[PDB]
Amino acid sequence: MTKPSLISAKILQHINSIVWLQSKGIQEPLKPDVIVNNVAYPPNVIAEKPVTNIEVITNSSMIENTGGVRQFLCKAVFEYTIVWVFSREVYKTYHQIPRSQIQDLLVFCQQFVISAYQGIDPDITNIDLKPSQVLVKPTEDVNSDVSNSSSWSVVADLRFMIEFLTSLDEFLPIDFNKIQPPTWELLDDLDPIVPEQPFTLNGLIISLNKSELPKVRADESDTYQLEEILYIPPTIEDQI
Amino acid sequence: MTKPSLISAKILQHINSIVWLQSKGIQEPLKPDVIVNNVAYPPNVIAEKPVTNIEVITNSSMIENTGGVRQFLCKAVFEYTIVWVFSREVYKTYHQIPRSQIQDLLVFCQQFVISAYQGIDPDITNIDLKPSQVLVKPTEDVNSDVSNSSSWSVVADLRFMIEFLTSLDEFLPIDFNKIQPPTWELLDDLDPIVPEQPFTLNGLIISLNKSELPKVRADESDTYQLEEILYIPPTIEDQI
Amino acid sequence: MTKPSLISAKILQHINSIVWLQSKGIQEPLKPDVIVNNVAYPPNVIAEKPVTNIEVITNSSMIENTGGVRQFLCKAVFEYTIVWVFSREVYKTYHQIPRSQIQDLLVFCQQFVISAYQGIDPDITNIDLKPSQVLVKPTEDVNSDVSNSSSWSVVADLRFMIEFLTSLDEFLPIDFNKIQPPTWELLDDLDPIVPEQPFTLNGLIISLNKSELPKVRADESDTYQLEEILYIPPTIEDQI
Amino acid sequence: MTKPSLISAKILQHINSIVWLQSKGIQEPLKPDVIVNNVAYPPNVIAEKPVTNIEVITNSSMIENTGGVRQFLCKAVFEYTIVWVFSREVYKTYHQIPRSQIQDLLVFCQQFVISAYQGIDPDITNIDLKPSQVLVKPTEDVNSDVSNSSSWSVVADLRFMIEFLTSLDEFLPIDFNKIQPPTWELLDDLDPIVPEQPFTLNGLIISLNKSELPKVRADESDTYQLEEILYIPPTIEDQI
Amino acid sequence: MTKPSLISAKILQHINSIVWLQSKGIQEPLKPDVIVNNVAYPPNVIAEKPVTNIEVITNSSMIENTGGVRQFLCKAVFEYTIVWVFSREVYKTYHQIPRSQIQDLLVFCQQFVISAYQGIDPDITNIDLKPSQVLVKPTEDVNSDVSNSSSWSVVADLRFMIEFLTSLDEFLPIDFNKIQPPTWELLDDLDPIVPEQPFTLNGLIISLNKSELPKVRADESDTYQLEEILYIPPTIEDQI
Amino acid sequence: MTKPSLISAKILQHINSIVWLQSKGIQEPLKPDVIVNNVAYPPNVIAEKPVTNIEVITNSSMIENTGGVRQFLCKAVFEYTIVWVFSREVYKTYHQIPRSQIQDLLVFCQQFVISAYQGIDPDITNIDLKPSQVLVKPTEDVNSDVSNSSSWSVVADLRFMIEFLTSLDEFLPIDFNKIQPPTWELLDDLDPIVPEQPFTLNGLIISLNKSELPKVRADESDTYQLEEILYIPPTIEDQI
């Protein structure tokens, strides 16, 4: 269904049991190493990137015409960036930083997000992985030790290509509450085109014709006689 | 048919029930948050980009030779850019801006424009979607809060690849009224090449020949005798 | 046949009934809006770009070996650029400029040039269209209103990929009159290689041999006797 | 299995009997030529690059559904850079440096790492080689001789594309010890989604129904009679 | 065969009856318009570019193993650039320059070079054309009129992809006369590897063996008796 | 086999009878024209570029599993650059330099290196040619004549893509003599992983079992009786 519920489930699966995310924001942390259980751990942040490549193809075999409202299959790329900052005070050389454990944590998150098909949204039809990039670039302006040497920053991206089912009926003015008012005015004094409304069958009228002897024709009015006009629920009489 | 009627229908489907477009113009808004029902909403704008990739292929199976005038299938890319400006006065951190709702609004517009095949123009043969790009770039020069920090700008593009039927007969000098005068002069004193005009059959003349005994030949003038000259409507006699 | 006659026909089809071309030249116009019938119209220009991608493939099924002179199929890309200048004095905002009508005029020219197969040259075998680009770039240095704001320029290109038949016999020193003298001298004192000349049959001589009894051999001179030497027109006797 | 054990085995295979690695670090060496057995050898270093292109495809024929926990196939690119510094004091001209021996050492390492399928990890399914690049760039700022001429640096990369099997069960909080605390708190006060736990069968209860004479139906409760309730281990009685 | 004879034939076909080449050199001409027959013509030059993409594939079906010396098929790209300078004194506007005639001259040269398969070299197996580029760039620093406006330069390239047969026997020290001395010394005191020399059969010796009764064996020396030793020309006796 | 022996053979084939290489080094020559037999020839140099694209695929049909040691097929690109310097004192114009002879010399080297399959190394399985590039760039800083005009430099590259067989047994510590000491110490106090050693069969012991009447089972110890223990060479008794 809707991408905000899906993205909330995606970040929940991300931080579920794999990555510990101390803060969420676009900024390398300048906090000291975090002390928990008398053990020091590096600062980290997560940047949730805006959803891109939002495309609706209507051209997949996994779209069922249920006959109520037209369904769609939507493709999206959901991009998350996790950054860990390793201070140079404790990590003197590049090779002693725990890059291996970061890669292990990254592959574990990839496996957990891929396996959780039924746990992210029921309407997910495909989840695929783009090749992840791991960078050991320096921090933005974060210095640790004497001489003002830049701290080690380990940056890992996760880009999930995900295909899921949607319908028109899933979107309501409640999810647009802080961006768009319901029932606004048209920008050029035009009328809004109202979509179709689900039609309810609250009466049926049948008018049958008794055709002439050779065969039914149904075009000329003298070749058939009106027999009766039938209202399938008797209560439709005198109502419409 | 013609692209201005089609583009008017396309923008109408866009603002129909999905995106609320406060203004139309190439400029990030410096208006305050718009107050409606005592609720504040971010400023927005739409840029309707000029139609590009206008190509006529005449090489598709959905072009019927009706025998009146030659039809064409035209492909075009119609590009719309919607920009929302979120002031930093209310939205202090990047992650608290409602990117999810913007993506939901974008996917809803994509679904609505794709479904409305019969509502945009009857002569649409294909509508497809390029991957949409969502950017969280800063505003052009719009500052909100103290220190003159740039406001958040959420930019979303929609590029519709659309294939539709056209004919020569659909274009008249009325739709060119403010760009081109009808019946202008040639730039090098040349003559204008007049296209074919629909021919009306207002008389038919048949001259049949009685051929010689072995077989019809129809080349030599002594091997056939003129019998009669027939004018299919009798009123063509003494007229032409 | 030859590209100058073809290009003259191509520009003639262009300005025939679609685009009104006020001037032909590589320069955005600084003339005022042109008044015709008391109606003001924007200035325009056309740039006819030099023919590029001139390739001769001799590898198509539409090349007939007529046995006189070797034919060729030539491919070329013919590029025309039409620029309209819309003054900011009348057109205050970008969205009120008549981009839709420009796109309509462009698609009409594309359809008219594509349909006119028999009208441009009889030897055209294919005409195809590259995707057209429509730009709303500013004018070169043309300012309209106060503050010296650059005028709106609408630039539309048309690139026709066109395949046509040619032969060696179609090119004569008349079409090179102002670029090359006929019968020039070789740059390194070399001799010019004269192409083959159409051979005319003005006499035929047959010398037949009466072969020996077992079979014709035709190699050894004692196994056949000369019977007669036949000159097919009697007037070839005593002539050659 | 896990990439840190695999990478430790990969560097071990690298330095096993092929490359002699004096130091491990991102820096061209400024140490003098190393004297061993009264023979001088050039300084060298190895840079172990961070693992990139970590992708989990779950779409290979070499993934067995064992029915315990879902397996995965992971692809990774492991990149090692070996740099040798040849002083200009001994190596006066470029062509007398032993580039051939470096290329021989490089091809030997490539062959040894490729052959050792069973020696790096048992769960390796594929090891492939990207084209190696050998550079004779100068040193960073290392000068040897008079005039401060830059020393010769021979840089050779080895990029192994490697596909291997993984499972969720292979990752424990022990391998994340210095990067992540076990059993942390959720960043938005959310609950952690616990993965499935291996279910142990410590009792089985069977309730069979005696169906009516025509056939089993199993939907309506009057068409079958409860016969007995069977506990497969007798000790499950009075326990659950 | 050899490329210098082929390239001499290629430039000869170029200037044969199509392009008039006043000078050959890499430089836009500053000579005045050339007066011949009291008619003024624009200056021109030709740049013969160095042969590139020289590749020997030995992997084509048009290479016959004649059994004397191994043949090859060589591919080359031969690039010629013709530049015409049109003074602004006579050619005031861009559109009045005779670009059409230049394109006609270019297509005529392309057709003539393509047709002349038997006239350039007998061993040509393929001649193909890359797409030609025609530029209306300004001259290098050539000014014509007042204000020092740059003259019009029309630049047209011709790149012939050509495949031809070669053999080792075609290259002799005569064609290298001014670049390489015959019979030079090896740069590292090595010996030169002499190619095979055509072997002439000036004698034949046959030694036949009379085999034992069950069958020929030809391995053990007691199972066959030497009968005679035959010298096919009797004069080989007492000679070798 | 090993690339240094192969590269020595490759440069030997290069200078064998085709290119005369006066010096080997990365530098355009400033020596005068070389006088031999009273004839002046241009200076030249050769740059042997470091071997790149060293890839071991183990995925070709030309790799035989001999069952001793695992073989490999190695691909490499061997790049040689030959530069000739033509002084402007003798060569006044560009077109009079002997580019044709240089191209002839280049194609002859390409043919000779391609043909010499059995002469470069016996284990070559493929030799292919990349498209060669011929440049007429100026010299680095070499001036000839008055005004200090840069001398003509003709640069031709030869890039051989070559596929050849290798094995682990071909590499010994003798070929690494000046780069790596034999039997070095591990960088992290690890043990070296010794490769398999060729196993020699110096004794065979067979213990056969007499099975029970219904059939051989070979799992339970009571269903078979030990008959004898056979040592195939009698001298293995009392030895092991």
Which of C4, C52, C193 is facing E133, going by the closest CB pair? Answer: C52
**DSSP assignment, residue B236?**
G
Interface probe with D: pick from A21, A101, A135, A137, most Cβ of D within 10 Å: A101
Does E173 reach chain F within 8 Å, measured CB to CB? no
- As a whole number of angstroms, the distance between CA C193 and CA C47 comes to 39
Closest-CA residue of chain D to F75? D131
Does A93 contact D195 at a Cβ distance shorter than 8 Å?
no
- Chain B residues touching residue A2 (CB < 8 angstroms): 104
Which residues contact residue A230 at a Cβ distance below 8 angstroms, ignoring those fewer than 6 apart? A205, A206, A207, A208
Does C132 contact B187 at a Cβ distance shorter than 8 Å?
no
Count other C-beta atoms under 10 Å from residue A5's C-beta.
Answer: 15
Does C52 contact E130 at a Cβ distance shorter than 8 Å?
no
Alpha helix segments (H runs only) across C15-146:
99-115, 117-120
Does A57 contact B99 at a Cβ distance shorter than 8 Å?
no
Give ∠ CA F46-F48-F54 in degrees, rounded to 5.
160
Interface of D with F in 72-91 (CB under 8 A): 84
- Please choose, from the candidates E60, E185, E64, E177, the residue with its C-alpha nearest in 3D space to the C-alpha of residue F104: E177
* Alpha carbon F36 to chain centroid, angstroms: 35
Which residues contact residue A43 at a Cβ distance below 8 angstroms, ignoring those fewer than 6 apart? A22, A29, A30, A31, A32, A33, A34, A84, A85
Does C103 contact B4 at a Cβ distance shorter than 8 Å?
yes
Does B35 reach chain C within 8 Å, measured CB to CB? no
Q: List chain C gaps (C–N > 2.5 A) by preceding residue.
A: none
Which amino acid does the sequence have at F55? E
Do D and E share at least 3 CB pairs under 8 Å?
A: no
Which residues contact residue D132 at a Cβ distance below 8 angstroms, ignoring those fewer than 6 apart? D106, D110, D156, D157, D158, D159, F52, F53, F54, F55
Give ∠ CA E56-C73-E73 in degrees, rounded to 5.
10
- As a whole number of angstroms, the distance between CA D144 and CA D159 comes to 31
Which of F104, F129, F135 is facing E175, going by the closest CB pair? Answer: F104
How many beta-carbon contacts under 8 Å exist across A and B? Answer: 116
**DSSP assignment, residue D179?**
T
Count other C-beta atoms under 10 Å from residue F226's C-beta.
Answer: 10
Residue in the structure block whose two tokens are 């006819």 = C48
- Chain C residues touching residue E94 (CB < 8 angstroms): 25-26
- As a whole number of angstroms, the distance between CA B73 and CA B50 comes to 20
Render the burial of F194-225: b for 16+ CB within 10 Å, e for the rest.
eeeeeeeeeeeeeeeeeeeeeeeeeeeeeebe
- As a whole number of angstroms, the distance between CA D132 and CA D110 comes to 9
Q: List chain A gaps (C–N > 2.5 A) by preceding residue.
A: none
Residue in the structure block whose two tokens are 């199972």 = E223
Do A and D share at least 3 CB pairs under 8 Å?
A: yes
* A80 contacts A122 by C-beta, under 8 angstroms: no
Which of A21, A36, A134 is facing D50, going by the closest CB pair? Answer: A134
- Chain E residues touching residue C12 (CB < 8 angstroms): none
Query: What is the distance in angstroms between the Cα of D237 and the nearest Cα belonging to chain A?
Result: 36
Does F58 reach chain D within 8 Å, measured CB to CB? yes
- Chain D residues touching residue F178 (CB < 8 angstroms): 41, 98, 101
Does E23 reach chain C within 8 Å, measured CB to CB? yes
**DSSP assignment, residue E95?**
G
Does C179 contact E23 at a Cβ distance shorter than 8 Å?
no
Does D37 contact F181 at a Cβ distance shorter than 8 Å?
yes
Does A19 contact D179 at a Cβ distance shorter than 8 Å?
no
- As a whole number of angstroms, the distance between CA C28 and CA C140 comes to 7
- As a whole number of angstroms, the distance between CA D75 and CA D52 comes to 9
* A7 contacts A51 by C-beta, under 8 angstroms: yes
Does D74 contact A107 at a Cβ distance shorter than 8 Å?
yes
* B162 contacts B127 by C-beta, under 8 angstroms: yes
Give ∠ CA B6-B11-B12 in degrees, rounded to 5.
90
Does B118 reach chain A within 8 Å, measured CB to CB? no
Which of C19, C110, C136 is facing B56, going by the closest CB pair? Answer: C110
How many beta-carbon contacts under 8 Å exist across B and C? Answer: 116
Tokens of A101: 């454990």
Tokens of A148: 């003002």
- Please choose, from the candidates B183, B234, B226, the residue with its C-alpha nearest in 3D space to the C-alpha of residue B207: B226
- Chain C residues touching residue E19 (CB < 8 angstroms): 180
Closest-CA residue of chain E to F15? E186
Does E111 reach chain C within 8 Å, measured CB to CB? yes
Interface probe with E: pick from C1, C2, C56, C73, most Cβ of E within 10 Å: C56
Does E14 reach chain F within 8 Å, measured CB to CB? no
In angstroms, how far apart are the furthest CA atoms of chain E?
Answer: 109
Which of F24, F99, F114 is facing E58, going by the closest CB pair? Answer: F114
Compute the CA torsion angle F82, F88, F90, F91 (nearest 10 deg): 70
Q: What's the residue count for chain C? A: 240
Does E115 contact C7 at a Cβ distance shorter than 8 Å?
no
For residue B153, give the H/E element and its range: strand B150-167
Does A52 contact B132 at a Cβ distance shorter than 8 Å?
yes
Closest-CA residue of chain A to D77? A131
Do F and C share at least 3 CB pairs under 8 Å?
A: no
Strands (E), F18-174: 34-36, 39-41, 44-48, 52-56, 71-86, 124-129, 134-135, 138-143, 150-167
- Chain D residues touching residue F186 (CB < 8 angstroms): 15
- As a whole number of angstroms, the distance between CA D127 and CA F72 comes to 14
DSSP F63-89: ----SSS-EEEEEEEEEEEEEEEE-TT
Phi and psi at A124, nearest 5°, equal -75, 125
Count other C-beta atoms under 10 Å from residue E221's C-beta.
Answer: 9
Does A112 reach chain D within 8 Å, measured CB to CB? yes
Closest-CA residue of chain D to F6? D100
- Please choose, from the candidates A169, A58, A57, A62, the residue with its C-alpha nearest in 3D space to the C-alpha of residue A123: A62
- Please choose, from the candidates F190, F85, F183, F176, the residue with its C-alpha nearest in 3D space to the C-alpha of residue F136: F85
Does B56 contact C107 at a Cβ distance shorter than 8 Å?
yes
Interface probe with A: pick from B111, B133, B135, most Cβ of A within 10 Å: B111
Does E131 contact C53 at a Cβ distance shorter than 8 Å?
yes
- Experimental method reported for this structure: cryo-EM
Closest-CA residue of chain B to C115? B70
Does A54 contact B19 at a Cβ distance shorter than 8 Å?
no
Give ∠ CA F7-F8-F11 in degrees, rounded to 5.
80
Count other C-beta atoms under 10 Å from residue B226's C-beta.
Answer: 10
Interface probe with E: pick from C7, C12, C27, C51, most Cβ of E within 10 Å: C51
Which amino acid does the sequence have at E27? Q
Query: What is the distance in angstroms between the Cα of E162 and the nearest Cα belonging to chain C?
Result: 13
Query: What is the distance in angstroms between the Cα of E108 and the nearest Cα belonging to chain C?
Result: 7
- Chain C residues touching residue E25 (CB < 8 angstroms): none
- As a whole number of angstroms, the distance between CA C38 and CA C85 comes to 19
Does D193 contact A13 at a Cβ distance shorter than 8 Å?
yes
Give ∠ CA B6-B10-B14 in degrees, rounded to 5.
170
Query: What is the distance in angstroms between the Cα of E191 and the nearest Cα belonging to chain C?
Result: 43
